């Protein structure tokens, strides 16, 4: 059930006395004339902070519970209006709807409305007033306690008839402090254009006139992104489809540059035997950039070819092309046993940077003789025809892999559909802004991309995918001004949105902006 809150729920924001002065403040307050939720109990959200009230004549409401769990999984604030005194605790309680321990803090202290605010470190305010369904009458709540406890409060309950709840919005208030230091009246500046006017003037009386109060600005309704069409894909499409894929004893490479590096196609690659990216993760690498990809390939028996990493130490990679620790980059692999293998399997090619381990087919490894030029028994060449069996799967059989470390090897720039005639954010290439993009007559030369104004600011764009010129207007904004008779005469007001078109917000389009609430007249005075 719901009911209008009227003006109830103002409280002394801070601990200071003020004379008969109008004080402006920012705090968590019950917005004027908002809905209280009325109850006649369930656990509820605390949200930002809670106004609460009831008319329980026989002190029927006995207390409250607050926390995240309201159960022994963590601590919870308990409050009870016991018959002798107020009692407060913070134990890790465990109870049902109402009871009828790590207790790190404790404290003790229908004719009527009993009325409170709970806030958060935690604080309470109250008032207790006679009543005749909330009164239309105004009275602020005095502070009642502040507790050092700092409990995580997100929900609350009630312990025990009619009672009310409402949520403290962040709000700007003007408060009428008075001769005894008391608050006698209040405004809620956000309520209506007259309440903005009262707050702007710092006054409860407002004279006949037109007053500025705020800036109206149309917000951008979405973000549009545009780039030229993708073209000139990376040579990866040939590399990972090469039946002639390089032997690790004779590894080979090329600079992928001036290309669309479509690494997203590898990121999603359900057929890939592996991916080995020691640099950027492939989801980011699909949008990476570098001067070129250092793209290079090798193949061996799968379990030995698994040694191929930057800063790795495996003997097979030492015997082929083992990368330095500075070789962080992208990598990918394929099942060579299914196609790259010969009749002898991995014997199709010389087994495990390109030739960077001083690797060649001559004498290499073994200190058994002075390395006289026989590639066998004198001083073994390690990278002979690979040992992986043709009948095995590509871990026991042969496997092939390639990799590339990082101004011209560029990932694809995705673009949105275009939008027209709406205030939106726009990105076109490196140009960013916020505006109403509109189709236009303004022709300009084939190499050119932008408009300009005389003030050297962006004024138009060529769309990079259908070469029309879009004239750009900023998102409409202007002053808000409140026309008013004196409050002494009426509370009725009319709003002028300066220089706006009434489409953009009775209503009247004046020559100075859109006027609201005022009636047009053909007489003159």
């Amino acid at each position, epitope marked *: 059930a719901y009911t209008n809150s009227f003006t109830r729920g103002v409280y002394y924001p801070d601990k200071v006395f003020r004379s008969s002065v109008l004080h402006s403040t920012q705090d968590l307050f019950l917005p004027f004339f908002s809905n209280v939720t009325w109850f006649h109990n369930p656990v509820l959200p605390f949200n930002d902070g809670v106004y609460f009230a009831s008319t329980e004549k026989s002190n029927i409401i006995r207390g409250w519970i607050f926390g995240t769990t309201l159960d022994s999984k963590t601590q919870s604030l308990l409050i009870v209006n016991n018959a002798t005194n107020v009692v407060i605790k913070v134990c890790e309680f465990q109870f049902c709807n109402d009871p009828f321990n790590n207790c790190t803090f404790e404290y003790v202290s229908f004719k009527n409305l009993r009325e409170f605010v709970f806030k958060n470190y935690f604080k309470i305010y109250s008032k207790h007033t006679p009543i005749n369904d909330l009164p239309q009458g105004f009275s602020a709540l005095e502070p009642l306690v502040d507790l050092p406890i700092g409990i995580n409060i997100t929900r609350f309950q009630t312990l025990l008839a009619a009672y009310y709840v409402g949520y403290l919005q962040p709000r700007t208030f003007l408060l009428k402090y008075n001769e005894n230091g008391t608050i006698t009246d209040a405004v809620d500046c956000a309520l209506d254009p007259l309440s903005e006017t009262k707050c702007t003037l710092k006054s409860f009386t407002v004279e006949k006139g037109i007053y500025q109060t705020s800036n109206f600005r149309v917000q951008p309704t979405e973000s549009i992104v545009r780039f030229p069409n993708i073209t000139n894909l990376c040579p990866f499409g040939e590399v990972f489809n090469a039946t002639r894929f390089a032997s690790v004893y004779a590894w080979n490479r090329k600079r992928i540059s001036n290309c669309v590096a479509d690494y997203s196609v590898l990121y999603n690659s359900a057929s890939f035997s592996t991916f080995k990216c020691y640099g950027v993760s492939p989801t980011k690498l699909n949008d990476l950039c570098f001067t070129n990809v250092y793209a290079d390939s090798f193949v061996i028996r799968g379990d030995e070819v698994r040694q191929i990493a930057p800063g790795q130490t495996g003997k097979i990679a030492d015997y082929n092309y083992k990368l330095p620790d500075d070789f962080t980059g992208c990598v990918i*692999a394929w099942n060579s046993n299914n196609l790259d293998s010969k009749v002898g399997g991995n014997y199709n090619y010389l087994y495990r940077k390109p030739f960077e381990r001083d690797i060649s087919e001559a004498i290499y490894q073994a200190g058994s003789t002075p390395c006289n030029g026989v590639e066998g028994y004198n001083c073994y060449f390690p990278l002979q025809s690979y040992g992986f069996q043709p009948t095995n799967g590509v871990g026991y059989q042969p496997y092939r892999v390639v990799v590339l470390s990082f101004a011209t090897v560029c990932g694809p720039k995705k673009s949105t559909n275009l939008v027209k005639n709406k205030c939106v954010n726009f990105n076109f290439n490196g140009l960013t802004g916020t505006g109403v993009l509109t189709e236009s007559n303004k022709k300009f030369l084939p190499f050119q991309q932008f408009g300009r104004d005389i003030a050297d600011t962006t004024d138009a764009v060529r769309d990079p995918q259908t070469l029309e010129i879009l004239d750009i207007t900023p998102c409409s904004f202007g002053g808000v001004s409140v026309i008013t008779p004196g409050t002494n005469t009426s509370n009725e007001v009319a709003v002028l949105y300066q220089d706006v078109n009434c489409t953009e917000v009775n209503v009247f389009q004046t020559r100075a902006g859109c006027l609201i609430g005022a009636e047009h007249v053909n007489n003159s005075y």
Partner: antibody, heavy 131, light 114 residues
Framework: QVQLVQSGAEVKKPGASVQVSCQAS????????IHWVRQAPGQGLEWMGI????????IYAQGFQGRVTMTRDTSLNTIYLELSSLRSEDTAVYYC????????????????????????WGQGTLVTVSS | DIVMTQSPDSLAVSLGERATINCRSS????????????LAWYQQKPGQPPKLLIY???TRESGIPDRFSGSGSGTDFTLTISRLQAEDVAVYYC?????????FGQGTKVEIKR
């Protein structure tokens, strides 16, 4: 440790079809090459194949390359299971084996590492020889 | 290929004595980059999918079989049986972190002599 489980237990026939299911979570779903682990009830189970369960990137043991199939489902907290032309051991129970995660800062499908050795197992969903 | 396979299929240990369940690969498991021993022992109930409990050929899981647990040795490995002939008498085999075709042996049994 892992959310390992097995499901869909039924009769399946040699040379004919079979069906199954398994449960997955955390690094065994998206950070390791999990094993499909199965055997005839006379022994502890072994790898029918190795699966990277996000996107499913797959390799099989050559006795079960045709006879058994597995599918990606890691975001569904799962792995899908099937068979066709089933082995003579068609009564073999099976479950997911929760592979140990990628041990270094490489990125993409980790099948370049590990084997059917795993930090958890789905206890084995039963089977019977439908022939 | 790796050939991860078990040796005894069953034990017959004396009560209060010890024995080992044994297993091996064919070659190179202390792999050349680090000698980082790419094997571990699965132990579980008979007929189950494999789970590791003697981890990384030199370590053990949280609440692992301990007196029934064990370690690698070159191409070979063992799980122990010190007073473990009953209750800790699991089905056990070594398995490889070594490769894609690598998998557990057929769950050879720790058990008491009869």
């Amino acid at each position: 440790q892992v959310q390992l489980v097995q499901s869909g237990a039924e009769v399946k026939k040699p040379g004919a079809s079979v069906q199954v299911s398994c449960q997955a979570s955390a690094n065994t779903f998206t950070n390791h090459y999990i094993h499909w682990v199965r055997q005839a009830p006379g022994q502890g189970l072994e790898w029918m194949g190795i699966i990277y369960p996000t996107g499913g990137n797959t390799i099989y043991a050559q006795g079960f390359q045709g006879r058994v199939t597995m599918t990606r489902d890691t975001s569904l907290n799962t792995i899908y299971l099937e068979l066709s032309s089933l082995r003579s051991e068609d009564t073999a129970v099976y479950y997911c084996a929760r592979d140990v995660r990628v041990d270094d800062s490489w990125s993409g499908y980790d099948l370049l590492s590990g084997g059917t050795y795993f930090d958890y197992w789905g206890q084995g969903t039963l089977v019977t020889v439908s022939s | 290929d790796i050939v991860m396979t078990q040796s005894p299929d069953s034990l017959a240990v004396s009560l209060g004595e010890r024995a080992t369940i044994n297993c091996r690969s064919s070659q190179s498991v202390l792999y050349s980059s680090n000698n980082e021993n790419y094997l571990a022992w699965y132990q579980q109930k008979p007929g189950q999918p494999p789970k590791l409990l003697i981890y990384w050929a030199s370590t053990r899981e949280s609440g692992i079989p301990d007196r029934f647990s064990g370690s690698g040795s070159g191409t070979d490995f063992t799980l122990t049986i010190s007073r473990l002939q009953a209750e800790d008498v699991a089905v056990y085999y070594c398995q490889q972190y070594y490769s894609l075709p690598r998998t557990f042996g057929q769950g050879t049994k720790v058990e008491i002599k009869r």
